[PDB]
């Protein structure tokens, strides 16, 4: 089997693994850190925002690749502000340094 993007979850909203249900393969820290050793800082951020956590990144990227310009707009992973609201229910001041 070989397939494409599939479904997303609910509580974290992240894409799928398993070919029959159109899975992408999960990675350990090993495999992103090989990319760090490599130097593809672009491709690293591509694998930090767009495909799993971020939205403006993936859709900006998608609009752009069909415009022919393959440009990068970084934003923020949802993971981050989630972290903040989680540690903020704990009653600690934590907040976004929104652009």
């Amino acid at each position: 089997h070989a397939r494409s993007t599939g479904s997303y979850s609910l509580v974290t909203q992240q894409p799928l693994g398993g070919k029959a249900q159109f899975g992408g393969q999960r990675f350990g820290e090993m495999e992103v850190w090989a990319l760090e050793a490599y130097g593809a800082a672009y491709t690293l951020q591509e694998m930090l925002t767009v495909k799993s956590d971020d939205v403006n990144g993936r859709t900006k990227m998608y609009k752009n690749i069909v415009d022919g310009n393959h440009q990068m707009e970084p934003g923020m992973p949802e993971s981050f502000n989630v972290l903040l609201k989680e540690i903020r229910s704990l009653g600690i001041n934590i907040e976004l340094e929104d652009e």
Binding site: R3, T12, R26, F27
Partner: protein, 1337 residues
């Protein structure tokens, strides 16, 4: 964009109010039927927002006509949606609750603030009774429980001046009451009067702590909660399923619990209810809070009907299932594929298969855009239907689009970089991926049901990286070590090894060839033997002149195969290259040499042609195996009859009631071993040259065609052990104990096994297999903990202008050279002018790139030590200089700034670490002898014997290199004195196994002194011989009566005096240790060289070396110099009264006296000298010695452990990872900063670059170095982000927020977690743009 830093402080209730958009009051979520929001519940749409955009619930006001309008019909604002992710609610509580992580975390940050203990406040707040909210009279204390019957005494005594009642409000008011300032300045004012001992340092602790809160800006009131936000709906969703079943996050549970308890408390407080229930409701509210905060830490976890406990917020950040490890660092991929793999034997290097089905699936946007461009599919309905119908043009245009369109390839596990590469597609209708066989090794991939995975460079930076960096053609060397990765797999090597062969038997001996053309005409016609040394002509070339080829021809009586091969050679080399039988070592060195002189492109086409040719004729060469390729030796029955008679004798011996078993049993195994090793001889003799094939003569024998020795000779598969286990005995076999069975495998695979031999093999199989399957985690942890440390290094000055640094000496030990100093020197700068063994023959003016002209010039010289301005010794602050690093390996030249590494180290070290877990002094050969720093003696017999444990023997060659290295028992018995010369292959020491002799070079009377029955000793007859003396037990067996005092049978003369050691004024008696059993009685006299006493007889260490855990049991090296003496007398272990010359004596350490010592009770050591027989803590080295010696010690030990396993890494890695250990600077003095404050050694250099300069001569303080580990350095970091990613995220978050941390997002993981660029790689140009900007204003 631009940033420096920002401030943080605690959450105001005013802040949660401001942030929030409306109070939530209810736990209610939706209707039972109309699945729609509830007013003032958790999903309050009027607070958090609506579902649609710029519309009210009735839909009056819409679409930016009515922008800031609230539809008064429903009171619903006309506002947009991305804030739904933002908008929070809040909750106002009945009574104050506190944050657990300001409470339950270690040093509490609230209890440490007050410094009043915990359990006091617990019972204040479990309300053991009334409790001093405020001991208005300090007569009463706050935090002081007052019972219902004792309170009345506080009451009618003072009445007014105390507050002693219940609740958190006690602590609220406390935090609000206390004032940090004037304590601080007062403690200072009386610090100046007498800056006291421990008293003042805790004054000072407080003073700085106080002022830290002061000037940092902090508000410990907000340690306490009054307002509680409400996480938005879609941060905790509640959705249906197909079958009507609903699905939620567990948080809603706890939200409902808290709101319900709070509202019930609002009820109970309106009724003035009996406040026992208000206490219970307060405990319950705080519990539900703390479970929202941390549920399964307190007590028994909360579980559903499932009986499984329910995940909290914290776990959604923490460990695996948090954001970080699972799905922020590591994603699922769009446009990917994976499936089973097979071989491409006719691939070129850049190629790869692509079943066009998945080609199409991944590239549908390109082909759709292109069907619209041509316009055949005028719309996407048309393009999609046309592409479901698979037009003929979809194929040609798939090829069009895929042409020059790289794609990635990924196999699990991705150990190092080269497990993932980028090839060019080759479109096929074969469902199996084809793969260029030579990169089976980088993938560690072999075709037994494997699947690879695939990834798509869409963007052009990614496409071009794939083609320039991941490409198959930019990656030809491991950066672990500069070896080629193009090894013949196992077949082209077998091929070539067959071709360029030189028999004697076939035909065509000694005619002539003008060249390899009629060699191919002949051999393709079927006339010559490929393997026959026959006279030919050659015409090689050479570039002797300045890159100018030099033609010549000659003749060489060489094989048909070398001849025919030689034309492939690209006309720059000699023929001696091909003039042997092409071992794979030669092939390594072939493409080496090829690459070296030629540059590269020949080596490319060359290697392609060699893969091509060896595969071709190796299919024409034929290769197989037969039953008679293993043997039926002629002597099979006779060996059996002999073994039969032998075991019959063994039986009869057993019958006697003599050899009983162990002698018999061991005897039996040894004879089986020898018998079938003779079988092994018989059989390997009965194959290899048994083919007597005459040719023009009587007879001649020649290597027969077995194919097993041939596949054993090239390096394809097999080796002498394989062939014995097929041929001879399969050695011995250890059952799971680790002991060794004494009745072996006798037979082999051809002859036939026994059931239990097999079954014994299953054990070792299973043990090794469980080791294999269960150490990928071990490397997992070591690698990933090391990487999470990863920061960089950047250069700033051409040369720091500084002086020497590190020494270079090669790594030859145990065997041969393992890193030529020729290589170690390569690319580095000299510390200094360096000479030759012809001395005062300087060759560098203190600093030169020593490229191989120099390293070869100095390989020519036998110069044997040179120094290097080290990157460590580079004294440029906040960076290094380039010469000190020396050469960029990729450039092959002195390095340029900005590119830096260290996961490279991780891959290089971890990737091999997967499987690679699974008396005497001799000289071998001639030469001088250079052994020292040993106390030894010419023993009674007249040869050398060690009397200082330190020495390890080495077998030195005539040039000077260590050939072998082995260890030597103290007090042994040699037959060689060091500084002699011997024939190798000699037992230099014939030692007694049990006796460790106690020889007395003195001749004096013995008499029982210092030693008395049942105190220091027992006296316990040597039973076998029968004579005895005082009998020294071991450490634990003797009673503690005289375990505090050393037993010493003493030598005397007729006078009783100390028979001094001959030649000195030192007395001679022996503090006898355990087993030191003297046999002859009191009053007896001993002689010269006479024994008073006879003394009878992994990867885990990798974990230990890297984690910096302390070494463990035994005694250690002299901590400090000066006279050293013995201490407290054996409460288990005796102590060591050190008495440094001018330093401080009081240090004394428990030592096993059972583990015998080196320095006596009144002998002096120098610091860093062994006390005993055992290791030392490396922290002793860093604290005692400097940095070079310690780091040298560690890197020594660790690469010994690896080098043991047949291992190789450029050890640059192992030192850079140790620079990343810790840079904690423990201040020595005070005056500028605190006395021993952990500071940046960087900022330390800064202050001393400010104060010690004419600002002062000195006002401040000096500083030291530190260690303590890698993981805590990971923790101990500027950022908390990279620190708050990994395990125990919780405590890290606590300690992060308590400072109100505001990391500046410069490190790797820091900018990573928000997905913005970091200093190098793709972001390198922009970062250095910012650098030049910082230089340019």
């Amino acid at each position: 964009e631009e940033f420096d830093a920002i401030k943080i402080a605690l959450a105001s209730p005013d802040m949660i109010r401001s942030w929030s958009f409306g109070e939530v009051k209810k736990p209610e979520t939706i209707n039972y039927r109309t699945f729609k929001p509830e007013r003032d519940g958790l999903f309050c749409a009027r607070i958090f927002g609506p579902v649609k955009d710029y519309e009210c619930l009735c839909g009056k006001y819409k679409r930016l006509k009515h922008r800031g309008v609230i539809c008064e019909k429903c009171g619903v604002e006309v506002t947009q949606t991305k804030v739904r992710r933002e908008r929070m609610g809040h909750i106002e509580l009945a009574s104050p609750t506190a944050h657990i992580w300001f409470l339950k975390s270690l040093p509490s940050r609230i209890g440490l603030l007050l410094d009043m203990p915990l359990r006091d406040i617990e019972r204040v707040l479990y309300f053991e009774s009334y409790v001093v909210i405020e001991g208005g009279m300090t007569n009463l204390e706050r935090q002081q429980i007052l019972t219902e019957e004792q309170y009345l005494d506080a009451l009618e005594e003072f009445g007014d001046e105390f507050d002693a009642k219940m609740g958190a409000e006690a602590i609220q008011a406390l935090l609000k009451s206390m004032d940090l300032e004037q304590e601080c300045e007062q403690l200072r004012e009386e610090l100046n009067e007498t800056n006291s001992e421990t008293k003042r340092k805790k004054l000072t602790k407080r003073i700085k702590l106080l002022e830290a809160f002061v000037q940092s800006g902090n508000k410990p009131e907000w340690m306490i909660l009054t307002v509680l936000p409400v996480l938005p709906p879609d941060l905790r969703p509640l959705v249906p399923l197909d079958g009507g079943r609903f699905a939620t996050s567990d948080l809603n549970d706890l939200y409902r619990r808290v709101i319900n308890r709070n509202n019930r408390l609002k009820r109970l407080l309106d009724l003035a209810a009996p406040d026992i229930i208000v206490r219970n409701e307060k405990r319950m509210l705080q519990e539900a809070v703390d479970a929202l905060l941390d549920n399964g830490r307190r007590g028994r976890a909360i579980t559903g009907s499932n009986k499984r406990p329910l995940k909290s917020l914290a776990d959604m950040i923490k460990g695996k299932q948090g954001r970080f490890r699972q799905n922020l660092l590591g994603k699922r991929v769009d446009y990917s594929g994976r499936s089973v793999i097979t071989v491409g034997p006719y691939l070129r290097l850049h190629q790869c298969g692509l079943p066009k089905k998945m080609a199409l699936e991944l590239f549908k946007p390109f082909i759709y855009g292109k069907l619209e461009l041509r316009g055949l599919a005028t719309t996407i309905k048309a393009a999609k239907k046309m592409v479901e119908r698979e037009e003929a043009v979809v194929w040609d245009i798939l090829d069009e689009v895929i042409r020059e369109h790289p794609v990635l390839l990924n196999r699990a596990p991705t150990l190092h970089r080269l497990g993932i590469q980028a090839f060019e597609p080759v479109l096929i209708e074969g469902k199996a991926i084809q793969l260029h066989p030579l990169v089976c090794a980088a993938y560690n991939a072999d075709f037994d049901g494997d699947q690879m995975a695939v990834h798509v460079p869409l963007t052009l930076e990614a496409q071009l990286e794939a083609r320039a960096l991941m490409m198959s053609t930019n990656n030809i060397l491991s950066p672990a070590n500069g070896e080629p990765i193009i090894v013949p797999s196992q077949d082209v090597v077998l091929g070539l090894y067959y071709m360029t062969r030189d028999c004697v038997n076939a035909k065509g001996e000694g005619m002539v060839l003008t060249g390899p053309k009629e060699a191919e005409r002949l051999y393709r016609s079927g006339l010559a033997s490929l393997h026959a040394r026959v006279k030919v002509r050659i015409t090689e070339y050479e570039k002797d002149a300045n890159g100018e080829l030099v033609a010549k021809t000659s003749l060489k009586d060489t094989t048909v195969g070398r001849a025919i091969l030689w034309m492939i050679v690209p006309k720059g080399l000699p023929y001696s290259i091909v003039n042997q039988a092409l071992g794979k070592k030669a092939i390594s060195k072939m493409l080496n040499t090829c690459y070296r002189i030629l540059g590269l492109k020949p080596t490319v086409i060359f290697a392609d042609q060699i893969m091509y040719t060896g595969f071709a004729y190796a299919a024409r060469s034929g290769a197989s195996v037969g039953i008679d390729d293993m043997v039926i030796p002629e002597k099979k029955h006779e060996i059996i009859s002999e073994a039969e008679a032998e075991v019959a004798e063994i039986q009869e011996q057993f019958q006697s009631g003599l050899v009983t078993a162990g002698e018999r049993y061991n005897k039996v195994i040894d004879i089986w071993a020898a018998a079938n090793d003779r079988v092994s001889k018989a059989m390997m003799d009965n194959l290899q040259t048994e083919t007597v094939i005459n040719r023009d003569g009587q007879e001649e024998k020649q290597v027969s065609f077995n194919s097993i020795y041939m596949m054993a000779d090239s390096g394809a598969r097999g080796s002498a052990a394989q062939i014995r286990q097929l041929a001879g005995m399969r050695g011995l076999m250890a059952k799971p104990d680790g002991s060794i069975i004494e009745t072996p495998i006798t037979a082999n695979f051809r002859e036939g096994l026994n059931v239990l031999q097999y079954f014994i093999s299953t054990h070792g199989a299973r043990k090794g297999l469980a080791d294999t399957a269960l150490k990928t985690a071990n490397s997992g942890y070591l690698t990933r903990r090391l990487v999470d440390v990863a920061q960089d290094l950047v250069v700033t000055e051409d040369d720091c202008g500084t002086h020497e640094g590190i020494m270079m000496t090669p790594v030859i030990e145990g065997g041969d050279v393992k890193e030529p100093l020729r290589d170690r020197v390569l690319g580095r700068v000299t510390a200094e002018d360096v000479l030759k063994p012809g001395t005062a023959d300087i060759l560098v003016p203190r600093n030169t790139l020593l490229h191989e002209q120099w390293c070869d010039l100095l390989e020519e010289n036998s110069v044997d030590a040179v120094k290097v301005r080290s990157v460590v010794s580079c004294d440029t602050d906040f960076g290094v200089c380039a010469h000190c690093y020396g050469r960029d390996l990729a450039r092959g030249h002195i390095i340029n700034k900005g590119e830096a590494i260290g996961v490279i180290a991780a891959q290089s070290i971890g990737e091999p670490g997967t499987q690679l877990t699974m008396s005497s002094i001799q000289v071998k050969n001639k030469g001088s002898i250079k052994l020292s720093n040993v106390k030894s003696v010419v023993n009674s017999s007249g040869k050398l014997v060690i009397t200082s444990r330190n020495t390890e023997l080495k077998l030195i060659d005539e040039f000077g290199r260590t050939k072998e290295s082995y260890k030597v028992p103290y007090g042994a018995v040699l037959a060689k004195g060091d500084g002699e010369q011997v024939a190798g292959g000699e037992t230099v020491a014939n030692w007694d196994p049990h006796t460790m002799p106690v020889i007395t070079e003195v001749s004096g009377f013995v008499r029982f002194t210092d030693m008395i029955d049942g105190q220091t000793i027992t006296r316990q007859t040597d039973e076998l011989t029968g004579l005895s003396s005082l009998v020294v037990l071991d450490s634990a067996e003797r009673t503690a009566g005289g375990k505090d005092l050393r037993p010493a049978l003493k030598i005397v003369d007729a006078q009783g005096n100390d028979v001094l050691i001959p030649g000195t004024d030192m007395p001679a008696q022996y503090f006898l240790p355990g087993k030191a059993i003297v046999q002859l009685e009191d009053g007896v006299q001993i002689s010269s060289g006479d024994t008073l006493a006879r003394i009878p007889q992994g990867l885990p260490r990798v974990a230990d070396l890297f984690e910096a855990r302390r070494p463990k049991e035994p005694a250690i090296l002299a901590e400090i110099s000066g006279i050293v003496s013995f201490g407290k007398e054996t409460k288990g272990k005796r102590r060591l009264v050190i008495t440094p010359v001018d330093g401080s004596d009081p240090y004394e350490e428990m030592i096993p006296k059972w583990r015998q010592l080196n320095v006596f009770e009144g002998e002096r050591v120098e610091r860093g000298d062994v006390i005993s027989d055992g290791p030392e803590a490396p922290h002793d080295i860093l604290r005692l010695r400097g940095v070079h010696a310690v780091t040298r010690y560690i890197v020594n030990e660790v690469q010994d452990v690896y080098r043991l396993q047949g291992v190789k890494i450029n050890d640059k890695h192992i030192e850079v990872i140790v620079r990343q250990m810790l840079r904690k600077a423990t201040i020595v003095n005070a005056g500028s900063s605190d006395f021993l404050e952990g500071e940046q050694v960087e900022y330390s250099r800064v202050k001393i670059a400010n104060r010690e300069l004419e600002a002062n001569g000195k006002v401040g303080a000096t500083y030291s170095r530190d260690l303590l580990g890698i993981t805590k350095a990971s923790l101990a970091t500027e950022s908390f982000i990279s620190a708050a990613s990994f395990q125990e995220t919780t405590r890290v978050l606590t300690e992060a927020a308590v400072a109100g941390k505001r990391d500046e997002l410069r490190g790797l993981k820091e900018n990573v977690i928000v997905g913005r660029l970091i200093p190098a790689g793709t972001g390198y140009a922009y970062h250095q743009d910012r650098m030049r900007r910082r230089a340019a204003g």
